[PDB]
Design a binder for this molecule. Structure first.
Ligand SMILES: COc1cc(F)c(F)c(Nc2ccc(I)cc2F)c1NS(=O)(=O)C1(C[C@H](O)CO)CC1
Ligand SMILES: Nc1ncnc2c1ncn2[C@@H]1O[C@H](COP(=O)(O)OP(=O)(O)OP(=O)(O)O)[C@@H](O)[C@H]1O
Ligand SMILES: [Mg+2]
Length: 291
């Protein structure tokens, strides 16, 4: 069935970002509850047609580690991207109510992220380009899925002019155009540290700050740090030695020396997390009071 603007009904607002706003809506014809993202674009109708046409490949992106897609269309002054509603929300959301996310859970999260990235690259030859806590969704069924990946080249271009203070961009991507899939690994690493420590990893916390846990920097000040200062390490002692090595392999400034999906897939931290028996659904639901 084809999605149409008048066939929807707003229920509430799931949130908003710099690029658009997403509502929890009901698709009356099917009775199915969906997440509808609205992206206001003040651009010619010809180009928007290309965008809507490029978003269609989303129907071919079927994976347990990727947010389900229902359809994309243009309504009145904005394109709509309709997707599966994840009652658990984004990790950055659960990160707030949780304050911090256990290494056990992060291991499962890491597996889903790696597999999602791997799927996108192997079966669709595309990189995410925007991996960060807010683009990792989870539901009461325990599923962990990636969303907001660059499927439409045209959309990427029309969004080239916004950003935001806190950046998850790799050093190579911040410096130039000489970046690719490896750039996503850096983002995952940084996102893991954030979720593991309880706040944006840069600048790193001091001895006194860590002891407590266990003003924002200026635009240039933060980017200069990322590019020149050494990468964010994970606090030793409170976290596993395998997990520490995992993020380290992720946060290597040089993209060619940095670990890739293939390597991380068979890394000690993943093998270990893979075997571990963790009840993500239970944790996710109790921490955010859902189930
Ligand atoms: C250009 O990125 C993008 C380029 C694309 F081709 C996309 F299809 C998207 N969005 C997107 C991708 C997969 C699913 I399942 C659901 C979605 F909503 C974005 N990301 S985004 O919707 O969050 C976006 C940019 C974002 O706000 C900047 O961080 C465009 C508004
Ligand atoms: N399919 C979905 N199901 C449930 N909630 C969602 C879904 N998609 C997005 N959201 C919620 O909507 C919020 C806004 O999403 P959006 O992608 O527009 O911005 P963002 O990723 O938070 O930030 P930015 O665009 O600035 O990087 C998210 O934080 C998330 O909690
Ligand atoms: Mg997002």
């Amino acid at each position: 069935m084809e999605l149409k603007d008048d066939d929807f009904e707003k229920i509430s607002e799931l949130g908003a970002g710099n690029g658009g706003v997403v509502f929890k809506v009901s698709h009356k014809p099917s009775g199915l509850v969906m997440a509808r993202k609205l992206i206001h674009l003040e651009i010619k109708p010809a180009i928007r047609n290309q965008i809507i046409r490029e978003l269609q490949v989303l129907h071919e992106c079927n994976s347990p580690y990727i947010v389900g897609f229902y359809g994309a269309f243009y309504s009145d002054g904005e394109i709509s991207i309709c997707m599966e509603h994840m009652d658990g929300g984004s990790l950055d959301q659960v990160l707030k109510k949780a304050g911090r996310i256990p290494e056990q859970i992060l291991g499962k999260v890491s597996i889903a992220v790696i597999k999602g990235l791997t799927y996108l690259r192997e079966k669709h030859k595309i990189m995410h380009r925007d991996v960060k806590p807010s683009n990792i969704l989870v539901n009461s069924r325990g599923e962990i899925k990636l969303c907001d990946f660059g499927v439409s080249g045209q959309l990427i271009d029309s969004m080239a002019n916004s950003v935001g203070t806190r950046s998850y961009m790799s050093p190579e991507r911040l410096q130039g155009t000489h970046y690719s899939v490896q750039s996503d690994i850096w983002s995952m690493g940084l996102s893991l540290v954030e979720m593991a420590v309880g706040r944006y990893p840069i600048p790193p916390p001091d001895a006194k700050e860590l002891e407590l846990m266990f003003p924002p920097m200026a635009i240039f000040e933060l980017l200069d740090y990322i590019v020149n200062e050494p990468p964010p390490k994970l606090p030793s002692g409170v976290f596993s030695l395998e997990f520490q090595d995992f993020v380290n392999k992720c946060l290597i400034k040089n993209p060619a020396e940095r670990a890739d999906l293939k390597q991380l897939m068979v890394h000690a931290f993943i093998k270990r997390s893979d075997a571990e028996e963790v009840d993500f659904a239970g944790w996710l639901c109790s921490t955010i009071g859902l189930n």
